[PDB]
Design a protein around this ligand. Structure first.
Ligand SMILES: CS(=O)(=O)Nc1ccc2c(NC(=O)[C@@H]3CN(S(=O)(=O)CC4(C#N)CC4)Cc4ccc(Cl)cc43)cncc2c1
Ligand SMILES: [Cl-]
Lengths: 298, 305
């Protein structure tokens, strides 16, 4: 029993974190085989023009106490790829994957190539992440682990004026309409991840919390008319299909759970909590709920 | 900016997790140098749990009855002894991945990371606190026994908890790494109940200072309070008494923000009286008590917004 915001074990990622210094800027890099991946703003803007002047020895790469020697450099979108002379012996099995809004991942927050903490978070519908990062965190990475394979999905680039975070996939493509420079940048209005709230309501029923259940059902259209009024993302037939296993395990149809969510949206919790929370939680996917209520190991 | 429930990087602990099997029971063990530490109830059947005589069960075991698996490698057991509620299995191979470590006993209110494991394989990491009633609100399934709690300070791992049991209420109980239970619990299936839980006041105050540091002051007021008057009100909401030590510990956060501890205590008093009125503090609708004063200083910046 119990329900915690659980992150993946970070060990496979810790052995890839390095410190990258270019002039006065110091941030984190990801060392996989003989390449170090890091935000291209470490050289800070015409990035072709800024990069062409730099030579290999301008980049200082530190892995623990060892200094790695840079032998080549290239740019891929907003990510700088530094060819080093040593392959990382601790390189895990890995893939670079682009995630979709609503999907979750673990973040290994780092400063000076040294990991300091791990937390779980979700890619918001407005493509920002509500992370916890201080100055020097740039280059910290987001990932998921599937069996022995680490799927890297995020690299931190910047903090928006509202305290939220923006970054890229490991191929350097930003999540959201963000650019990597100091300019007027604001996150769009955020919405609640409906399929995730429903998954968390199923997790609550699995842990003995059933006070919110009712005898009523709803149509997908009527639920979406109500949900769109509380700044909730539309619920699609795919979302319903994905919630299938949780519906079969508890005996509560997805549109039956939707009628409970509709009543919680119009009436609140009345001094009650669900899984120790007074708010409706949207940072656990249907897969996360299944994994935490099954026992999948890495 | 931002405030998350952050766990320590688990890598140093992942390299110590092993699977321990004795007869039909399989749980997790911690492999440090040439010793594997695990709950002594690995030698029990479910029947034995009602009134287990551990000394009588242990005397009947030989080294080869314990199967220890580290990844794909089988470790050979060459000795065994019991220390309180933990079983110490001497193995013939020292763990090459043994980090710098200490065994520390924590006090209620202190936080730590938990590396949840099944079959000697780590599956997830989360942050939690030792509750005032000595239980932990963890997330553990069958096979998680032997999972460990820890903190990391520089390169040193301080092991503080080993999971032993889930109580009928869903809360978890366990021992320090010397086998001494936290709380009045026994590794016996007896009707033992967790005492009424209370809120960790010093931690809620620390989290209110964290909100002030990240730029939020809506909850502050023009009042102060005596420590005694604060405690008379706090006890009424099932909040732990705030001691002079707690006030001393909050000193640096009071100096950083310019808000005296008893001034922050007056805001807490009023928050308990009025609730939040549709507002949140650091993205939460409840008063959070699982961040210590030390955690706040660690995660939050030295410069206030
Ligand atoms: C579906 S679940 O709730 O996740 N199931 C479990 C099962 C066993 C879990 C477990 N094991 C123990 O705590 C064992 C076995 N149990 S028990 O009765 O099976 C425990 C329960 C109760 N009430 C069912 C939950 C008695 C007992 C007494 C003393 C000592 Cl030292 C050890 C033990 C530890 N942590 C999480 C566990 C989740
Ligand atoms: Cl302590």
């Amino acid at each position: 029993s119990g329900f915690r915001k659980m992150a993946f074990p970070s060990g496979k990622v810790e052995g890839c974190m390095v410190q990258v210094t270019c002039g006065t800027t110091t941030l984190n890099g990801l060392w996989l085989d003989d390449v170090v991946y890091c935000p291209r703003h470490v050289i800070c803007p015409n990035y072709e023009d800024l990069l062409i002047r730099k030579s290999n020895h301008n980049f200082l790469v530190q892995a623990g106490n060892v200094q790695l020697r840079v032998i080549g450099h290239s740019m891929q979108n907003c990510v700088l790829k530094l060819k080093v002379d040593t392959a990382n012996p601790k390189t895990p099995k890995y893939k670079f994957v682009r995630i979709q809004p609503g999907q979750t991942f673990s973040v290994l927050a780092c400063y000076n190539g040294s990991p300091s903490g791990v937390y779980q978070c979700a890619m918001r519908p407005n493509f920002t992440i509500k992370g916890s990062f201080l100055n020097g965190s740039c280059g910290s990475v987001g990932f998921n682990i599937d069996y022995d394979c680490v799927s890297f999905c995020y690299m931190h680039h910047m903090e928006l004026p509202t305290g939220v975070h923006a970054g890229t996939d490991l191929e350097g493509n930003f999540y959201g309409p963000f650019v990597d420079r100091q300019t007027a940048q604001a996150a769009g209005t955020d919405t609640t991840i409906t399929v995730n709230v429903l998954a968390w309501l199923y997790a609550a029923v699995i842990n003995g919390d059933r006070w919110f259940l009712n005898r009523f059902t709803t149509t997908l259209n009527d639920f979406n008319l109500v949900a769109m009024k509380y700044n909730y993302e539309p619920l699609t037939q795919d979302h319903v299909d994905i919630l299938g296993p949780l519906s079969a395990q508890t005996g509560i149809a997805v549109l039956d759970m939707c009628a409970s969510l509709k009543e919680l949206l119009q009436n609140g919790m009345n001094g009650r909590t669900i899984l120790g929370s007074a708010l409706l939680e949207d940072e656990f996917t249907p897969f996360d709920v299944v994994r935490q209520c099954s026992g999948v190991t890495f």
